[PDB]
Amino acid sequence: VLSEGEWQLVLHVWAKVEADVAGHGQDILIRLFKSHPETLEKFDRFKHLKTEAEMKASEDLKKHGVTVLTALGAILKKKGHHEAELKPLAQSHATKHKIPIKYLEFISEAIIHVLHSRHPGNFGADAQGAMNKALELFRKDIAAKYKELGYQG
């Protein structure tokens, strides 16, 4: 369980993300796909993209980035009371997309990397630790839901 103090570090960096969610989503998706190319193969819409330049120029990738980060934002803003938000997300990522927890760990890493790089003013050691705690809570709750849904993750 996160303290309120930890949630405020989380939401204070998220407020900077929200200056330009589209830009942050591009950086984060591209970071994921470059760091762990196997993750791109899960995307039938995007797996043809060969290079970072092609990724940067993809209007649909940018759109998806916004979808992803807005969903994650809505979860974080619940400060752990995210049962309703996680249900549809768990069901799609388990049953339709088939995303192992391992890959959730990878996008968590991508998120932290990008925030560390873009927001040194709001992502010092304490803030990063809070965000890590929030993303670990997220993955823990998702993993539990995966199991309920019949997916080993």
Closest residue to Na ion, Cβ-based?
Answer: 19
Nearest approach in angstroms of CB 122 to ligand HEM is 19
Interface with ligand HEM (CB under 6 A), residue from 16, 34, 43, 122: 43
Helix (H) or strand (E) holding 98: none
| Residue from 17, 28, 30, 104 in contact with ligand HEM (CB under 6 A) | 104
Count how many Cα atoms sit within 13 Å of the Cα of residue 103 in the half-sphere of its side chain: 17
Q: Residue 46 class from Cβ within 10 Å (0-12 exposed, 13-18 middle, 19+ buried)?
A: middle
User: Per rule CB under 5 A, is residue 20 in the interface with Na ion?
Assistant: yes
The answer to whether 99 contacts ligand HEM (rule: CB under 6 A) is: yes
CA 141 vs CA 15, 19, 115, 120, 131: distances in Å: 24, 28, 23, 28, 15
Q: What minimum distance in Å lies between the beta carbon of 19 and ligand HEM?
A: 19
- Tell me the CA distances in angstroms from 61 to 97, 125, 128, 138, 148, one per residue in order: 16, 30, 26, 23, 31
Cβ nearer to Na ion, comparing 20 with 83: 20
Q: Which residues are annotated as a binding site?
A: 64, 93
Interface ranges with ligand HEM (CB under 6 A): 39, 42-43, 45, 67-68, 71-72, 89, 92-93, 97, 99, 103-104, 107
